Amino acid sequence: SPGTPGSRSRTPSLPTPPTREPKKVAVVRTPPKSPSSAKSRLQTAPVPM
Amino acid sequence: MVKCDPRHGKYMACCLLYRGDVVPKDVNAAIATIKTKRSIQFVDWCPTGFKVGINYQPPTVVPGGDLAKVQRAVCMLSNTTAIAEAWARLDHKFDLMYAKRAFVHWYVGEGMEEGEFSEAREDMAALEKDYEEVGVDSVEGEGEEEGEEY
C-alpha cells in the first residue's frame, strides 16, 4: 500500500475464530423403540348339541 | 316331605304305618274314606293300592323338641308319578351344566369318562318315559261336558 516516506507500521489482522462451518448439530437421531400391533381374539366355549 | 304336588301326579302305591292307641276298624274306615274321595286318583292298573301296619307303642319326642305329643300317630311311604316329575327337573339341571360341559374336569380328573355323563343322562331320560308309560294307566272316562240335538 502506498504511503509516507521511511518506516511504516507492521500490522497483521488474521482473525482466529472459525467461520460458519457445517455443524448444523440439531437433527433427530434416536426416537424411542416403538412397535404398533393390531390384535385379535376368538371366543371358544364348549359348543355341543 | 318332598316339594312336588301330588294332585299333579298320580298315586301308585301307599304303605300306612299306625302307632299307639289305634283301632283296626277306624284304620279301615280312614282308608275307605280316601278310596271314596277318588279325586285322590290312584292308578287304575292297581285298585288294591294300600298296605297297612299297626303297632301298640306311641311315638316319643326327644327332649328339647317341638313336635306335640300324641296318643296315636301315622307314617306313610307313597309311590306316585309326582316325584318322577321332580326327578325330571333335576335331570334338566344336569342337562344345562352338561350342555356347557361345566365342572366336568373335576370328575374326568379322577379317571372317569365324559361318556359316563352322556350314558347317565340317557338312562335317566329312559326312566322318565318309563314313568310316563305307567302314568298312562288307560283308565276309562266319565261323561261329556255338553249334550246333543235330535
UniProtKB/Swiss-Prot annotation, chain A:
<feature type="modified residue" description="Phosphothreonine; by CK1 and PDPK1">
    <location>
        <position position="4"/>
    </location>
</feature>
<feature type="modified residue" description="Phosphothreonine; by GSK3-beta and PDPK1">
    <location>
        <position position="30"/>
    </location>
</feature>
<comment type="subunit">
    <text>Interacts with MARK1, MARK2, MARK3 and MARK4. Interacts with PSMC2 through SQSTM1. Interacts with SQSTM1 when polyubiquitinated. Interacts with FKBP4. Binds to CSNK1D. Interacts with SGK1. Interacts with PIN1. Interacts with LRRK2. Interacts with LRP1, leading to endocytosis; this interaction is reduced in the presence of LRPAP1/RAP.</text>
</comment>
<feature type="glycosylation site" description="O-linked (GlcNAc) serine">
    <location>
        <position position="37"/>
    </location>
</feature>
<feature type="modified residue" description="Phosphoserine; by PHK">
    <location>
        <position position="36"/>
    </location>
</feature>
<feature type="site" description="Not glycated">
    <location>
        <position position="23"/>
    </location>
</feature>
<feature type="glycosylation site" description="N-linked (Glc) (glycation) lysine; in PHF-tau; in vitro">
    <location>
        <position position="33"/>
    </location>
</feature>
<feature type="modified residue" description="Phosphoserine; by PKA">
    <location>
        <position position="13"/>
    </location>
</feature>
<comment type="function">
    <text>Promotes microtubule assembly and stability, and might be involved in the establishment and maintenance of neuronal polarity. The C-terminus binds axonal microtubules while the N-terminus binds neural plasma membrane components, suggesting that tau functions as a linker protein between both. Axonal polarity is predetermined by TAU/MAPT localization (in the neuronal cell) in the domain of the cell body defined by the centrosome. The short isoforms allow plasticity of the cytoskeleton whereas the longer isoforms may preferentially play a role in its stabilization.</text>
</comment>
<protein>
    <recommendedName>
        <fullName>Microtubule-associated protein tau</fullName>
    </recommendedName>
</protein>
<feature type="modified residue" description="Phosphothreonine; by PDPK1">
    <location>
        <position position="16"/>
    </location>
</feature>
<feature type="site" description="Not glycated">
    <location>
        <position position="39"/>
    </location>
</feature>
<feature type="glycosylation site" description="O-linked (GlcNAc) serine">
    <location>
        <position position="7"/>
    </location>
</feature>
<feature type="modified residue" description="Phosphothreonine; by BRSK1, BRSK2, DYRK2 and PDPK1">
    <location>
        <position position="11"/>
    </location>
</feature>
<feature type="modified residue" description="Phosphoserine; by PDPK1">
    <location>
        <position position="34"/>
    </location>
</feature>
<feature type="modified residue" description="N6-acetyllysine">
    <location>
        <position position="24"/>
    </location>
</feature>
<feature type="glycosylation site" description="N-linked (Glc) (glycation) lysine; in PHF-tau; in vitro">
    <location>
        <position position="24"/>
    </location>
</feature>
<feature type="modified residue" description="Phosphoserine; by CK1, PDPK1 and TTBK1">
    <location>
        <position position="1"/>
    </location>
</feature>
UniProtKB/Swiss-Prot annotation, chain B:
<feature type="modified residue" description="Omega-N-methylarginine">
    <location>
        <position position="38"/>
    </location>
</feature>
<feature type="region of interest" description="Disordered">
    <location>
        <begin position="131"/>
        <end position="150"/>
    </location>
</feature>
<feature type="modified residue" description="3'-nitrotyrosine">
    <location>
        <position position="150"/>
    </location>
</feature>
<comment type="similarity">
    <text>Belongs to the tubulin family.</text>
</comment>
<feature type="cross-link" description="Glycyl lysine isopeptide (Lys-Gly) (interchain with G-Cter in ubiquitin)">
    <location>
        <position position="25"/>
    </location>
</feature>
<feature type="cross-link" description="Glycyl lysine isopeptide (Lys-Gly) (interchain with G-Cter in ubiquitin)">
    <location>
        <position position="69"/>
    </location>
</feature>
<feature type="modified residue" description="5-glutamyl polyglutamate">
    <location>
        <position position="142"/>
    </location>
</feature>
<feature type="site" description="Involved in polymerization">
    <location>
        <position position="150"/>
    </location>
</feature>
<feature type="modified residue" description="5-glutamyl polyglutamate">
    <location>
        <position position="144"/>
    </location>
</feature>
<protein>
    <recommendedName>
        <fullName>Tubulin alpha-1B chain</fullName>
    </recommendedName>
</protein>
<feature type="modified residue" description="Phosphoserine">
    <location>
        <position position="138"/>
    </location>
</feature>
<comment type="subunit">
    <text>Heterodimer of alpha- and beta-tubulin. A typical microtubule is a hollow water-filled tube with an outer diameter of 25 nm and an inner diameter of 15 nM. Alpha-beta heterodimers associate head-to-tail to form protofilaments running lengthwise along the microtubule wall with the beta-tubulin subunit facing the microtubule plus end conferring a structural polarity. Microtubules usually have 13 protofilaments but different protofilament numbers can be found in some organisms and specialized cells.</text>
</comment>
<comment type="function">
    <text>Tubulin is the major constituent of microtubules, protein filaments consisting of alpha- and beta-tubulin heterodimers. Microtubules grow by the addition of GTP-tubulin dimers to the microtubule end, where a stabilizing cap forms. Below the cap, tubulin dimers are in GDP-bound state, owing to GTPase activity of alpha-tubulin.</text>
</comment>
